[PDB]
């Protein structure tokens, strides 16, 4: 159920080469909170990749610590998928965490690397969050 302590979800960004604004994925619930993948271009140059948590809530008392693995799927060989691990205490003043320079933009969009196809790039996140605080008293 949504109370699950961990989960893995993906988000495929279309017309990736033309990305200009930051894109948001639908929500994935774990620990009963909405988690999303956030992608945006940073300086062409590099791919910004972040994990967002409970950002829609107007609450300022909640907090949830989690560890996750942020990965950019390589459709030609998952062994060549690039991923980085994170650990962070999520709360309103820091509802997202990740890397603004997660990968080189020219590399991810390289048709010969196997990360991009039909101008689509799939993002995956494996999050393992602890019980939250300041939410379900």
């Amino acid at each position: 159920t949504s109370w699950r302590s961990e989960a893995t979800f993906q988000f495929t960004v279309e017309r990736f080469s033309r990305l200009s604004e930051s894109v948001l994925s639908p929500p994935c619930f774990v620990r009963n909170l909405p988690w999303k993948i956030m992608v945006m271009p940073r300086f062409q140059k590099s791919v910004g990749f972040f994990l967002q948590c409970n950002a829609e809530s107007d609450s300022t008392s909640w907090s949830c610590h989690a560890q996750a693995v942020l990965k950019i799927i390589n459709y030609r060989d998952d062994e060549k998928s690039f991923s980085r691990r994170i650990s962070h205490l999520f709360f309103h003043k820091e509802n997202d965490w990740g890397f603004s320079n997660f990968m080189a933009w020219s590399e991810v969009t390289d048709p010969e690397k196997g990360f991009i196809d039909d101008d689509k790039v799939t993002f995956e996140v494996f999050v393992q969050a602890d019980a939250p605080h300041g939410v379900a008293w």
């Binding site: 956030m38 820091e94 965490w97 990740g98 320079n101």
Partner: peptide
């Protein structure tokens, strides 16, 4: 690189 928030 080093991790942070999108902000």
């Amino acid at each position: 690189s080093q991790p942070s928030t999108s902000s």
